[PDB]
Amino acid sequence: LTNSSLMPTLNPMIQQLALAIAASWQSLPLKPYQLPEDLGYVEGRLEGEKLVIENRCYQTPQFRKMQLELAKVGKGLDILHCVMFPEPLYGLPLFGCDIVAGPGGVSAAIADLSPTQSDRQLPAAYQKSLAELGQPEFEQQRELPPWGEIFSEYCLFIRPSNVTEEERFVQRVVDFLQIHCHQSIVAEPLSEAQTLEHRQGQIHYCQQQQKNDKTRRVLEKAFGEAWAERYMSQVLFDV
Ligand SMILES: C=CC1=C(C)/C(=C/c2[nH]c(/C=C3N=C(/C=C4\NC(=O)C(C)=C4C=C)C(C)=C\3CCC(=O)O)c(CCC(=O)O)c2C)NC1=O
Ligand SMILES: [Cl-]
Ligand SMILES: [Cl-]
């Protein structure tokens, strides 16, 4: 991220989270994952503000696709997007987060380890480790939209009320990542039937994420409907 031209210009909480995700991934057995058209930097404008996106994407033997996206609309709107898609073979949940900020501060901060099992439960080891963290206190909880049924009971979705809350949220994401990295080492490869069940969970996650009109409208205002549909369905949430 020392290469990133966006990084210095993003909201501080976004910068801290980007750093924490990069630190988590840094020493993994990474290889690039080529996004469609080998996408890296992209920008677009139509009738309004310009949208700029830096797309980073990797894979490891355990993670089919690990994506970190940093974006800015004009000077008014900063976004961090991250998903780790695991190889269904290993039955790991989906780490994801999304942070949206403007000049007033962070408006939305979401993070989760989302289930892929048909029973919509996290694996037992994750349930146990996540419970041990204790329920965080946040002053300004937000209720997930209907498509958000995909998220676990541990999902965070807040407007951070102050710096203390910003730092508490980032630390909980660091904690989720530490659990996830550890559980990735200690799983326990699954049956062919179980592998299928997990693959299905991931497809469902992607289909539901594509119902988010908040993302879609930002993309559409800069690039148009067709571009946004391709980006959401082929670049971000590839089924
Ligand atoms: C890549 C480009 C990208 C854009 C343009 C983007 C925009 C974006 N996401 C938003 C919300 C949101 N974003 C998410 C969740 C996610 N979204 C995700 O991409 C992932 C991985 C999760 C969860 C792990 C949720 C649940 C909301 C709230 C939606 C709503 O209020 O309707 C919002 C509304 C913010 C607010 O209401 O304060 C915007 C503008 N997010 C992006 O990621
Ligand atoms: Cl909905
Ligand atoms: Cl508008």
From Swiss-Prot:
Keywords: Oxidoreductase. GO terms for biological process: phytochromobilin biosynthetic process. The keyword Magnesium does not apply. It catalyses: (2R,3Z)-phycocyanobilin + 4 oxidized [2Fe-2S]-[ferredoxin] = biliverdin IXalpha + 4 reduced [2Fe-2S]-[ferredoxin] + 4 H(+). Its EC number is 1.3.7.5. Gene3D superfamilies: 3.40.1500.20. GO terms for molecular function: cobalt ion binding; phycocyanobilin:ferredoxin oxidoreductase activity. InterPro entries: Ferredoxin-dep_bilin_Rdtase, Ferredoxin_bilin_OxRdtase. Catalyzes the four-electron reduction of biliverdin IX-alpha (2-electron reduction at both the A and D rings); the reaction proceeds via an isolatable 2-electron intermediate, 181,182-dihydrobiliverdin. Belongs to the HY2 family. This is Phycocyanobilin:ferredoxin oxidoreductase.
